[PDB]
Symmetry: D2
Subunit: 237 residues, 4 copies
């Protein structure tokens, strides 16, 4: 199975697989059963921002999810990623709907990587930033039902013309260039990603969530991973 | 064939195709016969730095090659890339040798692309920076005799165990991800590239030179482009 | 007197001192009489963005001004800044009103400069970004009627409580740290600036205009420099 | 007196006040007695690099010191700077000597701070980078014995014309512009500092050390702060 590390903004509580009793954010290290979660007072219809950060010095993966004129949800977890992931990988966004549905619209997404070597003045880096997505976004690998072009937006899951969310949908978007997330001769290794999203749904129960993941270069949507599996995992183990 | 826009650091005057009677810097737009050139005091054996800059406000492509504590060659040329290049491209470095030879070593490469829109805050950007190339640089498409790893450098053309450069070689290095070089809805489109090189030669006259180029995504070393054609053009028209 | 290089967004045509008969943008080199201008379809009450760039290779200062979903104004002038300004300067914004008035609101502002000497891999740089101004901007030198914190914006010229602008006002804001605009061993110097502004007036004839400027460390508002002189020049010669 | 938060590179073990019996990297918070430390195998003579990192999500100040192909010391400590420093501060470097001396040469320095807000797309930032120090560095407030220009480096304490370092010397360097280290409603606040240094003593006894410090804007060298106090504190309490 693919090797995956995610930060999930989980909107539907699936109590049978470990989800707490409310919408929340969590750190996923190779399984959908989060290794750490925090309550998140989601706000249907309002644009929000996610901030993920990690540095090899204190070895902690941290996320913050907020809405304007409202409080933020924070989560942090100690993890030596150079002990869980391959040297090179691909980074991306994933999302889904099961029985219940929502829009998993992405307004912007930026990411930065930096490997600073032992030898002075020898850093290597990658930085991209999309504040507008085109119809044919030739630098993004779109998987599942993901599309770009709708008002310069990136729609991870399926949507009807009328603007209605669909169920049992799954879609992901991966940046085209393989990233060198870690390296042995690197003194400091770090990365950061930011995206603004807009989850909006007609139900009284939106499902299922959006997630930012780091995977292997050849990763693909697993079979039947809609709904509770966020298009990331093959099973809820 | 492929569309090419390049900045050539020509070490050998092929006066039969327009080359001036001395090693020069030139701006090639769809042809090996430069639109504008400038004398360059090719200083064999040492490390030089090149800087390429372009912005759509004043539509001027500019270059500057300089050696430490010495003179700088410079060239500019007004060109509206929108008219000459496809919206999406790949960028990269090329180099070749012929009857005569030289080592075409790259010690670091940088690039930045930006698309600022009419809409406030909307800006799309890409930036990569290599200060050390590994033996398996997975984010670089190595074409020809080009290889990475040696002293952490990128060798564009074939060199021997001792260090001696071989004639009639052709290598290329294209960054893996496609670049959105322009967009109609952008108020400002720009790019800057920088790279340090080391050209050495046992010959009384080295050849053929290094080049930075913007080409269509599916480009490759054309057939018979050794020597004077710098691995970029099919013929010499 | 002070040395001033500026890009002016002139809203009131004072034809007597050499002004087009419509709102314009222009390059001001040590004088209020522009060396080059461009017609500006100034929109009342709309938030606009001004982008200014400059590099020592092509030696050309350019500026674009645009409103979303509409046309753009571009202007360029060839000038060697090292033959005009001191090696160390201070950058800033300036605005004024006279017998006629308008609000000169700055919503955001960012700047970047780069000095790259002949010594390979050596670069000095400065960059700031303000996306909201607080009532206590300790890193800005405010002059004249200029104030910050007002709704998170920077008010260059005096306004009222209900909003209404006052005439015969002049204000300026400069970044605290002195900028090293050029030097001896420089291979390439360049700066880029961006600011979003809001201009609205009760009278169907606004005035006078906003301007981005570079000046010597010790620069203050000239005497009687309201109106047509945009708080930058001592006289109209 | 002034409020200090510093990361010290302590070359001399003053056990009588807390220094471990070996050189070390330590994290000081309003006191010369480090809250945390980590053994450091200082390497008299060769160039090193320190990298400080901090963010408000995990409220952890971390640092790494390394030399090429050698042991890198690391230190981290959980601390909420927002509950210790003013919103506006000044960042700088500091070094000192006493009965025993050393060279406290800074060859380069870079800093970056970002204030991300709950209100989306409203970030503020300051970033400077010095790769070559000038004889008249106007953007640096030089205090004590600090001087620039010597071979393009920054000398924090006194060295003779021949190069021999002088005891009982103390100097500082602070960036000219105040830094907004935190605002009451920022969702994320983070900074990163990097510098390369050369410390060498023509005898087997170096002292006293170099330190990156954050203080109130009006900070000035405390009296008798040489030697063991590193030019930061008025006493060893
Ligand atoms: O009413 N219920 O008790 C109840 C309804 C649906 C349910 O699961 C379905 O819908 C969820 C939300 O869309 C997904 O997480 C699941 O993967 C599956 O698609 C489970 C319980
Ligand atoms: O001595 N000569 O008159 C003379 C020598 C070599 C020559 O061309 C050959 O070598 C060049 C440099 O290596 C290449 O650019 C050409 O493509 C070809 O491989 C032409 C004339
Ligand atoms: O319409 N007019 O006949 C007319 C009215 C006023 C005028 O000059 C005044 O107002 C201008 C606009 O504020 C400023 O540029 C001048 O500095 C001065 O303050 C010139 C012509
Ligand atoms: O002989 N010794 O073992 C010995 C020599 C000097 C000494 O203290 C002095 O020198 C230190 C190093 O410069 C400073 O840290 C102190 O502040 C003081 O100025 C203590 C013991
Ligand atoms: Ca769930
Ligand atoms: Ca040639
Ligand atoms: Ca006017
Ligand atoms: Ca000590
Ligand atoms: Mn969950
Ligand atoms: Mn040529
Ligand atoms: Mn004018
Ligand atoms: Mn200590």
């Amino acid at each position: 199975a693919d090797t995956i590390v995610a930060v999930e903004l989980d909107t539907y509580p699936n109590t049978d697989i470990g989800d707490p009793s409310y919408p929340h954010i969590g750190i996923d290290i190779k399984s959908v059963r989060s290794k750490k979660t925090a309550k998140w007072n989601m706000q249907n219809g309002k644009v929000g921002t996610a901030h993920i950060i990690y540095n090899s010095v204190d070895k902690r993966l941290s996320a913050v999810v907020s809405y304007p004129n409202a409080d933020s949800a924070t989560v942090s977890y100690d993890v030596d990623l150079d002990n869980v992931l391959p040297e090179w990988v691909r980074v991306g966004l994933s999302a889904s709907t099961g029985l219940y549905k929502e829009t998993n619209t992405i307004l912007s997404w930026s990411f930065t990587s930096k490997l600073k070597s032992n030898s002075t003045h020898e850093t290597n880096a990658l930085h991209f930033m999309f504040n507008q997505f085109s119809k044919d976004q030739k630098d993004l690998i779109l998987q599942g039902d993901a599309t770009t072009g709708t008002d310069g937006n990136l729609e991870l899951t399926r949507v009807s013309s009328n603007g209605s969310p669909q169920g049992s949908s799954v879609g992901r978007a991966l940046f085209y260039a393989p990233v060198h997330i870690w390296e042995s001769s690197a003194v400091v290794a770090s990365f950061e990603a930011t995206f603004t999203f807009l989850i909006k749904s007609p139900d009284s129960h939106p499902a299922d969530g959006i997630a930012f993941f780091i995977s292997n270069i050849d990763s693909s949507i697993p079979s039947g991973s809609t709904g509770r599996l966020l298009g990331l995992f093959p099973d809820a183990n």
